[model samples]
Target: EVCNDEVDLYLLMDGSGSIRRHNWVNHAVPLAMKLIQQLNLNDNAIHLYASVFSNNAREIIRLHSDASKNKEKALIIIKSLLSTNLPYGKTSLTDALLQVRKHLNDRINRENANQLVVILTDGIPDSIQDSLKESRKLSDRGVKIAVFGIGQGINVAFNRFLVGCHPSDGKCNLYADSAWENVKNVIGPFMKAVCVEVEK
Candidate 1:
C-alpha cells in the first residue's frame, strides 16, 4: 500500500507459547499496552497498525487501522492478543519481518517519508535468520527498527546483531530488555533518536 503523508509505524508481536503463560499475561500484554499509551499519534494521514505472527508467518490482525488516535486502537489490539489462546507454535520472527518489509517497502509515500517497525518479543527466534537480514535491507533505506525484548530470557546477543547503529551504513537501532519499571522511559528517547536520525 502507498502512503501519502509519511510516518508509518508498525507494531509486531510474537504469539509463540514458549513465553510461559504467566509472562505472556503479565509482561507481553502489559508492554503492548504501555507502548500504546505512551505513543503520540496523529488523526489524519500518519497511520499505525500492528500484528502478531505465528507459525503461519502472516499478520494475524490489522490490529489498529488508520485513525486519528492510535493508542486507543492499539489498546483494542492488545486486548485481542491477551484474549487469544493460541499456544505452542513456532515463532515466525523471520517471516514476520519479511512480510513487514514487503508491506512497508511497497508503500508509496511522499518524498523522504519515514517508515518504522517496533518488534516486541521475549525469546529467541525459532526460525531462520531472514528477519535480521531483512532488517539490514530496510535499515539501509532509512527504515528504523526498534526492538523490545520483554523479559530476561531474551537473547540480546542475536538481537544486537540485527539492531544498533551502523558504522557507515546507518541502519537499525535495537533496544533490549524492556521490563515494566523502565518501559515508560523508552518512548521519549526512542522518538528523539528517530527524530535526530531521520532529520539528518
Candidate 2:
C-alpha cells in the first residue's frame, strides 16, 4: 500500500520536443493520472503542484491553488496536457527547477510538511550543470527529490541529481525504464518508493 505522508509534491513534467506524441499520450500522461489518483489530494495530506516544460516551463497547477486541493479539478487540468511544437526545443531543466524552488520557498508557514519535487524527463537538459546546482539548492532547504528518467535515451549521469545526496555517494532515486512496458511493470513499486515513507 502507498502510505500517506504530510508532503507537498510538485510534479515537474518534461514536455520537450524529444518526447514523442505516442509516448506522451500512452506513457507520461497516464503515469501522471495514475499517480494523482493515488494521492490524497482532498485533505492536503499530499498537496500537489504540476508544471510542464520544454524550451520553457508553464504551470499546469500551482501550489496552494484551488485545484491543488480538489482532486476532480486537478484531474481535468492534468488530462489537458498535450504535445507541442517544441520537440526539438531546449530541455530547460534549470529554468523549471528554479521556478519550482521559488514557489516552494514562498510557502513558509506550512508545518511538518515534507517538500518533494518529482521530475519526469527522458533526456539530458540544455543546462545540465546549472540544473544540478539548482537541485542542490533545493536539497539544502531540506527538500526531497525523485526523478523518473523514462525511455532509452536518458543519460545515466543525470541520475546523480535524482535525490538530495552527495554525488559521490552514488545514491540515486532515478527509475530508468527502457520502454513503457517496463515502466508499467514497476510503476507501483516506483511510486511507493517515491511517496511512501517506510517504517524505520
Candidate 3:
C-alpha cells in the first residue's frame, strides 16, 4: 500500500487442511505476494515479516536487518519457500497470533513504527476463545489487525469471531465471501482499507 506511516508489517498465512491443495499452490501464494508488493517495501516506510501456521507456527523470515533492508529479496524468499509445507493439519490461529506478539515484543524499533498484521485463514481456529482474548490484548497494545476468512469453511458464526481479532469500529474484520477463484475480489476491499481507510 502507499503508506505515509512507517510500519512494521507481519503477514500470517494459514497452512491448514481446510484450504484446497491446488488453491494454496496456485492462488493463495500468488495473491499474497501481490498484497506484499503493494507496500513501499524498498524504502524506510515499511519493514516486512512473514510466517505460515497450521498445527504449529514457523517464521519464514524474521524482522531483522537483512529482511528489512532488502524487501525484494524478502519477497522472493517468501515466494520460493511458501509452498514447501503441506496443508495437512488443524488450524492453530492462537499459536500464530502469540508468535506475532512475540515478534512485536522483540523488536527494538517497535515504538517508532505502526504495527499491523495481515492474517488469512479458513474456517474456525483450534482455540477461538484464547485467540480472541490475545487479540484484544494485542489491540490494546496498538497493533492493527486485518483478517480474511477464506473458502466455504467459514460462516456467519465464525465471522463474528473473526471481527474480534481486529482493531476497528463499524467495519467488519472478516472478508466473508472469499474463495480461491474470487480471491482478488475478496482481497480488493481489504487492500483498500489498508491503503486508505474508508467507511464500508
Candidate 4:
C-alpha cells in the first residue's frame, strides 16, 4: 500500500527552456506518469489535474474535470504532455500555482481527501518571492507540496522554501517518508535528470 491518505493531486509541470524537449519528454513526463502509477486512484482518492508552465500557465485538466473518474484516462492525459507545443521560456511557477489554486478551490472535498501539488522544474522562476507567496497561500489552504528539481543549477533554496523542511542531507525526503510514497525515489540527484546525462 502507498499510504492511507486519499488525495486530490495537482501536478504543476515545468516547460521552461532549460528543461528542453529531451528532458521534458523523457524525464519530466515520465516522472509524472510513474508517480501517478503509484497512486491508489480510487474514488474520492488521488485524482490527477495538471498545469504545464513555461512563460505562463495553462490547464491540462480541470479539478472537477474527471467524470466517471477513469484512472486510465488520467494516465493518458499525462502522457499527452510530450505533445505540448507551448514555447519553452522563462519559468513562471507563481502563475502556474495561482491557476491551479483556482481549479482546486472550485470543488471542496466531500471526503477526507488531502490536497497535494507536485512541482517539477529544472529552472529558476521569474520570481521566487512571488512563487513563495503563492506557495504560502496554498499551504494556508492545507495543501501539501512536493518539488522535484530536474537538472543542474536548480535553486535549492527555492525548493526548500516551498517544501518547508528538508533533511539536511540535501535529499529532500520531506514528502517521501510518510506523507507521500510516490516520492520514494525522488531524493537528491535521483530527482535530478535521470533520463538525460548528468549536467554540470
- Model 3 C-alpha RMSD vs. true structure (Å) is 4.5
Question: Could you estimate the TM-score for every candidate?
Answer: 0.69, 0.76, 0.76, 0.71
Q: What digit string (tens of lDDT, one per residue) describes model 1 on residues 48-163?
A: 66765345445634444334567567567556663442343445677767777778666675565567777776677764366677778888877777766655666666666666
Candidate 3 structure quality by residue, lDDT tens digits, 1-200: 34445777777776454535566555767777666656666447677777753245466464342354586785566676554444434446777788888877775864567777777665567676887887877788877777766777755455444545233335464433466678776575565566453112
Which regions of candidate 2 are displaced past 4 Å? 15-21, 52-57, 63-74, 81-91, 165-178, 197-200
- What C-alpha lDDT, on a 0 to 100 scale, does residue 37 get in candidate 1? 48
The list of candidate 4 runs beyond 4 A from truth reads 17-21, 52-57, 60-77, 85-91, 166-172, 175-200
- Give one clash count per candidate, in the order shown: 2, 2, 2, 0
lDDT of 1 at 140: 85
Positional deviation of 46 in candidate 3, in angstroms?
A: 1.6
> Alpha-carbon error at 183 in model 3, in Å?
0.7
Candidates' C-alpha lDDT: 0.59, 0.63, 0.63, 0.59
Task: Compose the digit string of candidate 4's lDDT tens values, residues 8-114.
Answer: 66777765546245555455556666655555555655576667532353554643323466867745655665335235444578888888788777867746666
Model 3 residue 143 CA deviation (Å) reads 1.0
Cα lDDT, model 4, residue 89: 44
- Clashing residue pairs, candidate 4? none
What is residue 58's positional error in candidate 4, in angstroms? 0.9
In candidate 4 the C-alpha lDDT for residue 85 amounts to: 25
lDDT, model 3, position 80: 61
- lDDT score, residue 135, model 1? 78
Tell me the lDDT of model 4 at 190. 34
